[PDB]
């Protein structure tokens, strides 16, 4: 197995996947690495299994259909994995914890949002459709862009949104378009 966490790229107290060489801190994996379970298989492996059991699941889909899906176990897992892919980027730090807004010439968002809030919401089964998870993820970056206006820091929102959107299209097999 790898000697660094797949998500944050640091060493420490690492749990190793039994079916692949990846490793994780407990609370870096989503869901948090499970207490017992031998063997244990990481989210990467669990997602690959879904794909292998239903190869047709990789055929192109419309985003509107994907958003309306209920959060049954496979869609719950897919959202967990998508959230984890965002945390894999180091720039996710800016969006992880609860923000605050005191900048001359800007007013904070009406509905603040952050990654650890989406993480808690997934863990508490608060989303009934994929749309609820995707709307809160997009709101993170939209709030950022609106608040920072012309400051070049706005770019961090565009960057992390792009990581979200590419991973969304991959994980939910969104039909490719020009």
Residues found near Zn ion in the complex (CB under 5 A): 5, 7-8, 17, 20, 25, 28, 42, 44-45, 54
* Residue 44 or 172 having the CB closest to Zn ion: 44
Cβ 10 to Zn ion shortest distance, Å: 6
Residue count of the chain? 178
Cα distances (angstroms) measured from residue 69 to each of 119, 129, 154, 178: 19, 5, 32, 25
Task: Please name which of 160, 124, 125, 127 lies closest in space to residue 142, comparing C-alpha atoms.
Answer: 160
* Residue 57 or 128 having the CB closest to Zn ion: 57
* Residue 81 or 164 having the CB closest to Zn ion: 81
Q: Which residue is nearest to Zn ion, using beta carbons?
A: 5
Cβ 5 to Zn ion shortest distance, Å: 3
Cβ 96 to Zn ion shortest distance, Å: 12
Cβ 162 to Zn ion shortest distance, Å: 22
* Residue 1 or 170 having the CB closest to Zn ion: 1
* Residue 50 or 174 having the CB closest to Zn ion: 50
The alpha helices in 60-129, defined as continuous H runs, are 63-67, 73-87, 93-96, 115-123
Please tell me the distance from the alpha carbon of residue 80 to that of residue 123, in angstroms, as a whole number: 9
Task: Please name which of 146, 139, 149, 103 lies closest in space to residue 118, comparing C-alpha atoms.
Answer: 139
Please tell me the distance from the alpha carbon of residue 105 to that of residue 98, in angstroms, as a whole number: 21
Cβ 73 to Zn ion shortest distance, Å: 16
Phi then psi for residue 113, to 5 deg, are -155, 150
């Amino acid at each position: 197995n790898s000697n660094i966490c797949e998500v944050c790229n640091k060493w420490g107290r690492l749990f190793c996947c039994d079916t692949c060489p990846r490793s994780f801190h407990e609370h870096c994996h989503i869901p948090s690495v499970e207490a017992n379970k031998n063997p244990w298989s990481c989210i990467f492996c669990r997602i690959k299994t879904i794909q292998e059991r239903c190869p047709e699941s990789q055929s192109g889909h419309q985003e509107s259909e994907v958003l309306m899906r209920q959060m049954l176990p496979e869609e719950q897992l897919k959202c967990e994995f998508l959230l984890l892919k965002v945390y894999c980027d180091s720039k996710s730090c800016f969006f992880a914890s609860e923000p605050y807004y005191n900048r001359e010439g800007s007013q904070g968002p009406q509905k603040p949002m952050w990654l650890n809030k989406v993480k808690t919401s997934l863990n508490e089964q608060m989303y009934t459709r994929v749309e609820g998870f995707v709307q809160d993820m997009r709101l993170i970056f939209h709030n950022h862009k609106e608040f920072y206006r012309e400051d070049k820091f706005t770019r961090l929102g565009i960057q992390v949104q792009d990581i979200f959107e590419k991973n969304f299209r991959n994980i939910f097999a969104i039909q490719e378009t020009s």
